[PDB]
Structure 1
Amino acid sequence: LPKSVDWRKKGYVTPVKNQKQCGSAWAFSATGALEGQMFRKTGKLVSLSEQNLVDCSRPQGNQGCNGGFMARAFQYVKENGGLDSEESYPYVAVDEICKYRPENSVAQDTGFTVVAPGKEKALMKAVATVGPISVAMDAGHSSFQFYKSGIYFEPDCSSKNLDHGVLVVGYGFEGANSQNSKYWLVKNSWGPEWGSNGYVKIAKDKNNHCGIATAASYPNV
């Protein structure tokens, strides 16, 4: 596998978004992964609608602004036959009426693939060969709230009880040895003001820190 990967350098990632006061991180993680797969398939980077997901995927088991799961969103895109663009179905941060329009669809998936649970080596392989991957993590910590630089490592992090969906856009390492002080490059959905331009480096190969490889998945396009 590559020693480092950064899909943002290849045009697969949109600018950082902000979920505001709505528990829709799961939807932002989902669109970020679909945005990268659509980019890989067509060479066109188009911002997708997290609102489409919030308002229309309750049948798949999502709960709009009260939470959800990336696999359930990819399932919604599959069953639904499409997903509209951010431009056509804007984000308002509140649960609203489903207004999915097939004519404005700019993405589709035939389902999704799951990364073997708890396997950081497996997630590394998915990131290197597919593109950005949706992952769940335990972000309920003040240290995460106030993160700004460096490799994030929090003793209270759990690898099992997770509460936030994010996007792994690559991985790297500090220094010259590609074998130590490794980290996952993660895109958050709390605006570009949070963290480092909206991103955070999370400790990699430190026992599935914060559960990054516990429930990873990506849409099949």
Structure 2
Amino acid sequence: AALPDSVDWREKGCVTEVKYQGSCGASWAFSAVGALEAQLKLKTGKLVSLSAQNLVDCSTEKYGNKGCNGGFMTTAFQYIIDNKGIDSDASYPYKAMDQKCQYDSKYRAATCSKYTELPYGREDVLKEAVANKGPVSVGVDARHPSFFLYRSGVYYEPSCTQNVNHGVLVVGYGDLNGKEYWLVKNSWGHNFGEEGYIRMARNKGNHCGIASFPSYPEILQ
């Protein structure tokens, strides 16, 4: 045991406000910028919301992504590398639909040097990345009423699978009343769960596929 028993990156002012994706399946775009927003804060001291809409409109078919019909955080990061930047959310706000690409380099608020993917199903490796690097973009299996209806406590769904279909951000981990959890930031607004967060069962056999496809970006000096 060489890691903290608990982490929460919100407490270092590294997490932006919970967003609301609505009826556009842009959880992957929110997951991606969430993670890159923390690296930018660590780097620059400034906490700035980055443009998930930029990803939806611009990180498209060349990156295997389909906008509001889904995509991946790893290739969202590759776009941001290839494009040599991403706009701030305030210059390029979220509309919850597919649009023409309107990136403007004058409004670039972050960059990406590289990203790292973690091995599938490894909750000890995920825990290390979150303690030592920052918030980690993950997929979860969110296709269950109990997920949609989640209010509080440590989520555990018996019929949850490791096949992921929903992009979220791991911003911490800990133990609440006997139950180890990952602290997860969703993009369903503030009225979902614990002011927009869900604590999901940890060290429970890759529960809901939380450790199936982690990745995190880096901004180097």
TM-score (norm 1): 0.96
| Selected match of 1:190 from 145, 168, 188 | 188
* Uncovered stretches (5+) of structure 2, i.e. residues with no partner: none
* Uncovered stretches (5+) of structure 1, i.e. residues with no partner: none
**Residue in structure 1 matched with residue 65 of structure 2 by the alignment:** 62
**Residue in structure 2 matched with residue 19 of structure 1 by the alignment:** 21
CA distance in 2 between partners of 1:72 and 1:206 (Å):
28
Residue correspondence of structure 1 range 8-157 to structure 2 within 5 A: 8-58=10-60, 59-157=62-160
CA distance in 2 between partners of 1:174 and 1:201 (Å):
9
Deviation at 1:131? 0.9
The total of aligned residue pairs comes to 216
Which stretches of structure 1, 4 residues or longer, exceed 4 Å deviation after superposition? none
CA distance in 1 between partners of 2:33 and 2:146 (Å):
26
Deviations 1:22-65 (A, max 9, x none): 01100000010000111111111000000000000112111110
Matched, 1:7 2:17: no
The percent identity for this pair of structures is 57
Cα root mean square deviation, aligned: 0.7
Deviation at 1:111? 2.1
Deviation at 1:181? 1.4
Per the alignment, in what secondary structure is the counterpart of residue 77 of structure 1? helix
CA distance in 1 between partners of 2:104 and 2:64 (Å):
21
